[PDB]
Amino acid sequence: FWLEVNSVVDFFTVPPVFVSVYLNRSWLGLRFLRALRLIQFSEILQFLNILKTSNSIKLVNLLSIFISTWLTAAGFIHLVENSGDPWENFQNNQALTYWECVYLLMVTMSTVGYGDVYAKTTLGRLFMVFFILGGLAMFASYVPEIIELIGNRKKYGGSYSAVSGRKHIVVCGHIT
Amino acid sequence: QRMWWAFLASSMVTFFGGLFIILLWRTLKYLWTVCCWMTSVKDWAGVMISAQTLTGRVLVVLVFALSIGALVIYFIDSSNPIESCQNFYKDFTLQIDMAFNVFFLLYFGLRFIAANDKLWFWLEVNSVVDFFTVPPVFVSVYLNRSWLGLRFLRALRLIQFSEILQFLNILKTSNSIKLVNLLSIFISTWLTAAGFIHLVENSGDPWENFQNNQALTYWECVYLLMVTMSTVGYGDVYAKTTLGRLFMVFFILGGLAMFASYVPEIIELIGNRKKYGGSYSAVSGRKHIVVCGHIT
Amino acid sequence: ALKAGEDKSIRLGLFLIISGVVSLFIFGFCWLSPALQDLQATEANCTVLSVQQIGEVFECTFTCGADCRGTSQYPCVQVYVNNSESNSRALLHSDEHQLLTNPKCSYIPPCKRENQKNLESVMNWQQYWKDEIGSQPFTCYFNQHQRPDDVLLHRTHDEIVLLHCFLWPLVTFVVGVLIVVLTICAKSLAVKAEAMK
Amino acid sequence: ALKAGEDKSIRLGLFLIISGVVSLFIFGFCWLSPALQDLQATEANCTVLSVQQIGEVFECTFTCGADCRGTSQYPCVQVYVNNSESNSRALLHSDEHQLLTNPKCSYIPPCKRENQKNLESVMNWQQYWKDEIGSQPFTCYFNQHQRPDDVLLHRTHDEIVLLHCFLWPLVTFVVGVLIVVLTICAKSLAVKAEAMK
């Protein structure tokens, strides 16, 4: 339990807020890691009976993994660009907003790469090389989406919604 | 003076001259019939410890670790404005590099005496890598001046890392050996190509008197190759020289559609599944049962 | 059962080990060229020869908050020293960043909203060095291996950032090997102690 | 057996041949436009008409080591010549790169850290040409086909780099065809000599 992912997310979110109120000074640290809590949104939709067919649960699970990973990676790049390389006395920092980092990750992972926004720091370059090599060819290059995009078809109906007042008939056997 | 050609010549002349004298020795050994101790110890004196024997780890495992050391020294050399005279004597520098390179020479000679065919051994890839790494260090200590030439070619020694992991019994299933072999081919090719581009950009086009050079670090070249081969292409860093453009066109046409567009990875990514277990790890004290026949 | 989770500790241990090692190599390659250069600057003894202005005027940028980018002038003071290690004249700069942002002048004032305050600041600095001419020698940083024309009052980096950068990845390597050792105990000595029940 | 490796020599030979040929074409297309232009400049005989300064002042950049980028002034000297091949006035420049980096002036000093040394260098150059007025004619490089207003003291390129660039790919082509010929012998004359045993 201690080294389960959600435990780690809690350790890197919760203690520094207590530090921040004891020192009475707010901090923009690793708090973006709370985005990983979106991973289990797939549970909420089935507990609330919004989602009731398994392939759609897998689809929303994969989609939430994508969105949460995108927002998390944008947080790391935001932190790493706004604080410069330490071997350059943090002088070479770049004043990106978090939304410029979200946009940069999108323009990069689609492999468009305009270069209107890009990572300047050495650490930023290192993170982008990792994110390109992990985002392509390990995080993408999934097969589930090509088998689950027909998921909304490979299941044919739940149960007949019998209205009152209308008569009703069942037909079975050799149907062609 | 900047006498770059003297270092390069030592590799060119040893490779092509050795090729000539092997071809001529063979040809004259044949034409001899138209005009009409030494052979024994080679089978053991190095071959007992070179490879595949029980404790013959050194002349594959250590030469690998030393090749990584030599490559790291090339990364150190690449971090300076190519004009520094403190990091040159009684620090580590060329004097520590020499200790790797003389071992490479001795190991090459051992391989040469062990060779079943001298010609096919001479133009084997690792022989070529040794010819373009080893002679210019001797030039550099005779002229007593360090050189940032083709030393990045030592990265090709990573190709056979797949052997080390099976000799040390770290890797024991064949598809994972193929996976690590392909991965090492990728990493070594990436670092090698980045070396060529680093050399070609930091020295300008000769038809422009080398004036149009670009001061890229080796790591900017590694990054450029990555941003290019993923086809992102920001253009924050790109090749400026004419030779750089030529190399990039070749690297794009060879990296895509010949070096990539492999099928092995799509059949070996399920490799960790298409094998189902090795052997049962029978603990002491626990009882144990086998079930077989029609299992469904 | 414990074993089904204990090897997660192995994986984490191993990750912390290799992460530490890789981090040490990465921080190595990028620190060493700056660090070498900044220690290649020797420390020497110096005394000022003369203090003067060359009459040339330079621009600076004042940030009046939130991306404000106004600009102001300042006059170019120059100061030169005797040098104990080269016994040749060299030009005093405050620090490497000051030399870099203007290699023509011995000082750059903290750029103010009005020219009169830049002026006054330069005079206030100049009159101090007009007293330090000859009297009370000082130590000076000097780089004859690559930049023999100039001297500095300070090094480029504070050593704490360098050593602080190197110790933590080593510490994470130590924590990694410690974690895998503790798990090796909690794997092997556990069954050795429990099988007796 | 030899044959299983001998065709690797064939492949390598063939590679060295086609590599040499392709390299000759590549170096051809990129050398020829510069080389043509630099030989289209004729060599002529010249004498200086007059030496003067136009009073205009130009900027230069001084590199005080390791990406230092300070700047200094210099005054614009102009020198004009009589021309044996055009019999019309033309303006003397030292070389094509000097003309390119400043087409307004006859000389550019090696840019120094202080204006007084740029000044002194320009005067030191000027006084030499104040003696070479009329006395002792000199050869001069001249390009009436495209730039008839100016003359140079030197060509743009040293011929060694051109010929050195062209000879080595030709040499590798020669080595390639030699290697394939030697292998053709070690293939055919080998079996012709060995089948008799």
Swiss-Prot record, chain A:
- Segments spanning the bilayer are 1-19, 24-44, 60-80, 127-147
Subcellular localization(s) per the UniProt record: Cell membrane
Residue positions of motif Selectivity for potassium: 111-114
Q: How is it modified after translation?
A: Phosphorylated. Phosphorylation by kinases such as PKA and/or PKG. In smooth muscles, phosphorylation affects its activity. Palmitoylation by ZDHHC22 and ZDHHC23 within the intracellular linker between the S0 and S1 transmembrane domains regulates localization to the plasma membrane. Depalmitoylated by LYPLA1 and LYPLAL1, leading to retard exit from the trans-Golgi network.
Impact upon substituting residue 34 to N: Induces reduction in the coupling between calcium and channel opening
- Residue spans, topological domain Extracellular: 20-23, 81-94, 118-126
Kindly provide the intramembrane ranges recorded for this chain.
Answer: 95-117
Any miscellaneous information on file? The protein was initially thought to contain two functionally distinct parts: The core channel (from the N-terminus to the S9 segment) that mediates the channel activity, and the cytoplasmic tail (from the S9 segment to the C-terminus) that mediates the calcium sensing. The situation is however more complex, since the core channel also contains binding sites for Ca(2+) and Mg(2+).
Q: What is the similarity comment for this entry?
A: Belongs to the potassium channel family. Calcium-activated (TC 1.A.1.3) subfamily. KCa1.1/KCNMA1 sub-subfamily.
What disease is associated with this protein? Paroxysmal non-kinesigenic dyskinesia 3 with or without generalized epilepsy: An autosomal dominant neurologic disorder characterized by absence seizures, generalized tonic-clonic seizures, paroxysmal nonkinesigenic dyskinesia and involuntary dystonic or choreiform movements. Onset is usually in childhood. Patients may have seizures only, dyskinesia only, or both.
Q: Quaternary structure per UniProt?
A: Homotetramer; which constitutes the calcium-activated potassium channel. Interacts with RAB11B. Interacts with beta subunits KCNMB1, KCNMB2, KCNMB3 and KCNMB4. Interacts with gamma subunits LRRC26, LRRC38, LRRC52 and LRRC55. Beta and gamma subunits are accessory, and modulate its activity.
* The protein's role, per its UniProt record: Potassium channel activated by both membrane depolarization or increase in cytosolic Ca(2+) that mediates export of K(+). It is also activated by the concentration of cytosolic Mg(2+). Its activation dampens the excitatory events that elevate the cytosolic Ca(2+) concentration and/or depolarize the cell membrane. It therefore contributes to repolarization of the membrane potential.
Tell me the domain comment.
The S0 segment is essential for the modulation by the accessory beta subunits KCNMB1, KCNMB2, KCNMB3 and KCNMB4.
Q: What is this protein called?
A: Calcium-activated potassium channel subunit alpha-1
From Swiss-Prot, chains C, D:
Membrane side Extracellular: which residues? 33-159
Q: Where in the cell is it found?
A: Membrane
Task: Keywords in alphabetical order, please.
Answer: Glycoprotein, Ion channel, Ion transport, Membrane, Phosphoprotein, Transmembrane, Transmembrane helix, Transport
Tissue specificity as recorded in UniProt: Predominantly expressed in brain. In brain, it is expressed in the cerebellum, cerebral cortex, medulla, spinal cord, occipital pole, frontal lobe, temporal lobe, putamen, amygdala, caudate nucleus, corpus callosum, hippocampus, substantia nigra and thalamus. Weakly or not expressed in other tissues.
Q: Which residues are glycosylated?
A: 45, 82
Leader sequence range is none
Q: What is any Pfam family matched here?
A: CaKB
How changing residue 82 to A affects the protein?
Loss of N-glycosylation and reduced protection against charybdotoxin
Chief localization class? membrane
Residues on the membrane's Cytoplasmic side span: 181-197
Q: Name one GO biological process term.
A: regulation of neurotransmitter secretion
Provide the effect of residue 45 to A: Loss of N-glycosylation and reduced protection against charybdotoxin
The membrane topology noted for this protein in its Swiss-Prot or TrEMBL record is:
Multi-pass membrane protein
According to the UniProt record, what happens if one changes residue 9 to A? Answer: Suppresses the effect of okadaic acid and increases activation time constant
The entry's cellular-component GO terms read: plasma membrane; synapse; voltage-gated potassium channel complex
Entry's Gene Ontology molecular function annotations: calcium-activated potassium channel activity; potassium channel regulator activity; voltage-gated monoatomic ion channel activity involved in regulation of presynaptic membrane potential
Mark the transmembrane ranges.
Answer: 12-32, 160-180
Give a short account of what the protein does. Answer: Regulatory subunit of the calcium activated potassium KCNMA1 (maxiK) channel. Modulates the calcium sensitivity and gating kinetics of KCNMA1, thereby contributing to KCNMA1 channel diversity. Decreases the gating kinetics and calcium sensitivity of the KCNMA1 channel, but with fast deactivation kinetics. May decrease KCNMA1 channel openings at low calcium concentrations but increases channel openings at high calcium concentrations. Makes KCNMA1 channel resistant to 100 nM charybdotoxin (CTX) toxin concentrations.
Entry note about domains: Resistance to charybdotoxin (CTX) toxin is mediated by the extracellular domain.
Q: What else is known?
A: Treatment with okadaic acid reduces its effect on KCNMA1.
Listed under subunit, the entry gives: Interacts with KCNMA1 tetramer. There are probably 4 molecules of KCMNB4 per KCNMA1 tetramer. Interacts with FMR1 (via N-terminus).
Regarding protein family, the annotation reads: Belongs to the KCNMB (TC 8.A.14.1) family. KCNMB4 subfamily.
Give the protein's recorded name. Calcium-activated potassium channel subunit beta-4
Its lineage reads: Eukaryota, Metazoa, Chordata, Craniata, Vertebrata
Q: Which gene encodes it?
A: KCNMB4
